[PDB]
Amino acid sequence: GSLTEDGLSYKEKFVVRSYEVGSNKTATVETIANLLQEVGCNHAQSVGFATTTTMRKLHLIWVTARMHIEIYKYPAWGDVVEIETWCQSEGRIGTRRDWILKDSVTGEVTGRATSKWVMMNQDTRRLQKVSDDVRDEYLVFCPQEPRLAFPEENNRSLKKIPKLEDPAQYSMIGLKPRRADLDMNQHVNNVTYIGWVLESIPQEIVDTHELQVITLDYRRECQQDDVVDSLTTTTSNDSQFLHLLRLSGDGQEINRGTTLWRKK
Amino acid sequence: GSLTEDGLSYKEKFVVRSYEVGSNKTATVETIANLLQEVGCNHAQSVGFATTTTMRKLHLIWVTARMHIEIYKYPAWGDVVEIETWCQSEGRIGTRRDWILKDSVTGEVTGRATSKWVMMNQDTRRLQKVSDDVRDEYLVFCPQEPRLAFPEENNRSLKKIPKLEDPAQYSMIGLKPRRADLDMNQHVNNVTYIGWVLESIPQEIVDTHELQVITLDYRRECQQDDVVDSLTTTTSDSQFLHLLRLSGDGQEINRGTTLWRKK
Ligand SMILES: N#CCC(=O)NC1CCCCC1
Numbered sequence: 001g002s003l004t005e006d007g008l009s010y011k012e013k014f015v016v017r018s019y020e021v022g023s024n025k026t027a028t029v030e031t032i033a034n035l036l037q038e039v040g041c042n043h044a045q046s047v048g049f050a051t052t053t054t055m056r057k058l059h060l061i062w063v064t065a066r067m068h069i070e071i072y073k074y075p076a077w078g079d080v081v082e083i084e085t086w087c088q089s090e091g092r093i094g095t096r097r098d099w100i101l102k103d104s105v106t107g108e109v110t111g112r113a114t115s116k117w118v119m120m121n122q123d124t125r126r127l128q129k130v131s132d133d134v135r136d137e138y139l140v141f142c143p144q145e146p147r148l149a150f151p152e153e154n155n156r157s158l159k160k161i162p163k164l165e166d167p168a169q170y171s172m173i174g175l176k177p178r179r180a181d182l183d184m185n186q187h188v189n190n191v192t193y194i195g196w197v198l199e200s201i202p203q204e205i206v207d208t209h210e211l212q213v214i215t216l217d218y219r220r221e222c223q224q225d226d227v228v229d230s231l232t233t234t235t236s237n238d239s240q241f242l243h244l245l246r247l248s249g250d251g252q253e254i255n256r257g258t259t260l261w262r263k264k
Numbered sequence: 265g266s267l268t269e270d271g272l273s274y275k276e277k278f279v280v281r282s283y284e285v286g287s288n289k290t291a292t293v294e295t296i297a298n299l300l301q302e303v304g305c306n307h308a309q310s311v312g313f314a315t316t317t318t319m320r321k322l323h324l325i326w327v328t329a330r331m332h333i334e335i336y337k338y339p340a341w342g343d344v345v346e347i348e349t350w351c352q353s354e355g356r357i358g359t360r361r362d363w364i365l366k367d368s369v370t371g372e373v374t375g376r377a378t379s380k381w382v383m384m385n386q387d388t389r390r391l392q393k394v395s396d397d398v399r400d401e402y403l404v405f406c407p408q409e410p411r412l413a414f415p416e417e418n419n420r421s422l423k424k425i426p427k428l429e430d431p432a433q434y435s436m437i438g439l440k441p442r443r444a445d446l447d448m449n450q451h452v453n454n455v456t457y458i459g460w461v462l463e464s465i466p467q468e469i470v471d472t473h474e475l476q477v478i479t480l481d482y483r484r485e486c487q488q489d490d491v492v493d494s495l496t497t498t499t500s501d502s503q504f505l506h507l508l509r510l511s512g513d514g515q516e517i518n519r520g521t522t523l524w525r526k527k
């Protein structure tokens with residue numbers, strides 16, 4: 001991987017692995033999300049980091065608030081996928097990381113993704129606005145004019161998601177993270193939540209449809225000793241679902257989302 | 265990746281990923297096991313496949329009976345690891361796949377692994393001996409003289425493993441596979457069982473020790489709708505005896521041992 005000529009974005013190529021593919025012999029959405037995360041981390045390292053100087057002094061971190069992924073073609077086992085990523089400041093609300101996925105052979109766009117990140121104190125877990133000093137320190141690494149993976153004025157990446165009402169149509173109960181689900185700081189990896197959401201989709205939908213769009217809101221973290229319940233209700237040749245992840249016991253919300261599936 | 269000059273083994277280089285490392289910023293044993301599995305699959309594809317012509321017509325497949333891994337140094341995040349793999353016939357018993365892990369920069373051996381594979385009919389799930397026809401079709405891709413990742417006489421990779429007796433010292437119950445744990449044929453990936461075994465090791469041990477050796481026997485598969493219990497007892501450096509069994513009737517799925525060195 002490497003930064004582009006202007007130093008304002010980063011590209012990396014990946015060969016899709018045997019254990020990374022599902023029943024169709026194409027990469028799962030969780031493999032795609034892990035690749036986005038890896039290219040995101042390599043971009044941050046290449047430019048000096050994603051805690052800045054001022055963030056480390058004030059015990060502040062970036063946390064994912066929302067993730068939105070749209071896939072047109074999942075790469076097959078052995079195929080090479082090229083991913084381009086960049087960051088942008090969104091004033092004092094937070095930051096945004098965007099991605100474009102391309103087939104290395106054809107150069108065609110096979111997917112795109114966007115994510116919203118908010119500032120948070122590591123210790124108190126209290127969200128806050130982006131200070132001027134932090135915003136100035138990361139603007140040297142971002143394009144100045146807007147560059148959006150989802151430019152459309154009526155796009156599905158900015159839609160408000162409602163809370164699923166009991167009773168859910170489908171459910172998968174008692175989901176727990178194992179050590180492979182944790183990152184290097186022992187926090188549950190953001191991609192695990194995508195897997196947990198998809199666990200309540202019936203196997204018949206997965207067998208006859210391909211996942212086209214997934215929007216996920218992150219409300220609260222799952223601790224490594226927590227237990228989660230995954231709930232899904234059909235809201236709809238296309239199928240839409242409303243999703244909810246909550247703690248198995250008290251029912252505390254951890255995530256909410258929507259998925260759109262197209263018939264194969 | 266590519267086959268070596270003589271075409272009797274295969275090498276591939278991997279850059280360790282951010283999500284592939286644990287709390288020590290080095291690759292987990294499950295990342296290592298996934299890399300062994302990937303280089304194994306790439307070796308099979310490069311030589312024409314690991315179902316052969318005779319196996320496809322007879323509805324036969326290779327299944328893992330045992331896996332043994334020894335790690336001296338886990339590669340750090342961003343490091344390049346080079347893995348060499350080869351296969352060997354073991355007469356009528358089955359086949360063996362071996363691996364050597366090296367630091368790409370220094371060329372030093374940082375790990376080694378061996379695995380025993382047995383023939384099985386896909387449909388009946390009945391184990392079988394290897395026929396002469398299969399033996400001949402496999403021998404053109406294997407070294408003729410023995411080449412062993414663990415050559416030492418009376419080494420850890422060939423030790424008989426006993427069955428853990430109740431009550432277990434430690435346990436993790438109600439473990440279930442999710443879709444990310446399944447392979448392309450909807451079977452639970454062999455690496456998931458390694459993760460499930462390690463789930464009953466206390467976090468205190470993981471925080472103060474590094475895993476040096478793991479030997480795992482595969483007795484029966486876990487279906488995607490099955491629930492597993494993971495049991496561990498200290499037998500001792502720290503040694504542990506492990507057992508995975510179905511949550512309900514207690515049917516054995518795996519047994520194994522781990523050796524851990526203090527950091
Ligand atoms: N953390 C991290 C890497 C990153 O930049 N993005 C990740 C986190 C959100 C879901 C997958 C993509």
Ligand SMILES: N#CCC(=O)NC1CCCCC1
Nearest residue numbers: 297300301304305328331454
């Ligand atoms: N299947 C397959 C790939 C392969 O050759 N070996 C794998 C399976 C056993 C555990 C990890 C290594």
